[PDB]
Amino acid sequence: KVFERCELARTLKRLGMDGYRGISLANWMCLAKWESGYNTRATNYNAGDRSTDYGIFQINSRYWCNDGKTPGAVNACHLSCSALLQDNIADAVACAKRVVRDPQGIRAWVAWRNRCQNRDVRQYVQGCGV
Numbered sequence: 077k078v079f080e081r082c083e084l085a086r087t088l089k090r091l092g093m094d095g096y097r098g099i100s101l102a103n104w105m106c107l108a109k110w111e112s113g114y115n116t117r118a119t120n121y122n123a124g125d126r127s128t129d130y131g132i133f134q135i136n137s138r139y140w141c142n143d144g145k146t147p148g149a150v151n152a153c154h155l156s157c158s159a160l161l162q163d164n165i166a167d168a169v170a171c172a173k174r175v176v177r178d179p180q181g182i183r184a185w186v187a188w189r190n191r192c193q194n195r196d197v198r199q200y201v202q203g204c205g206v
Contacts, residue, residue: 077163078114081105084132086205091169094201099182101204102197107182108133110191116163131160133172140171 085101088094094101112118116132127146129136135153137143141160142151153159153171160168176182183189 077116081109081114081200082204084108084114085201087165088169089201089205091166093169093173094206096173097176097181099176100197100201102192102200103182103194104133104176105200106192106197107185107188110187111185116160116165116168119161130157131168131172132165133175135160135168135172135175140175 085105088101088104093099093104108114111134112132114132117130118132118134119128119130120134121128122136125136125138125146127136127138128143130141130143135141135157137146137149137151137157139148139150140152141155141157142149143157152174153167155167155171159166160171162168175184183194188194
């Protein structure tokens, strides 16, 4: 379910990620819509780990969720990968939160520096879905 750019910002704020751990709605919108495009079902196979990711932020089942086939699945969220497979990112966004809860944050991907590098993104969440 890929909606407009100011549509997921309303779902993210209602969840609680707004101003969470320093990652504002625009910080995740700048990378989530770029790595998938507001598509929680954006799943693809991995030629290096042979695993599969599920969620709008490419959440993998190797170190974030336990699916049943990923070897060494530590599942930090402790939830099934079906939560990130649905557009209802209630528990899905909660699993991706653990990815930015570490000391790295949302800068784990190189696209973060090539997209906005945490610049003035307050316009994407200025009266969008608060």
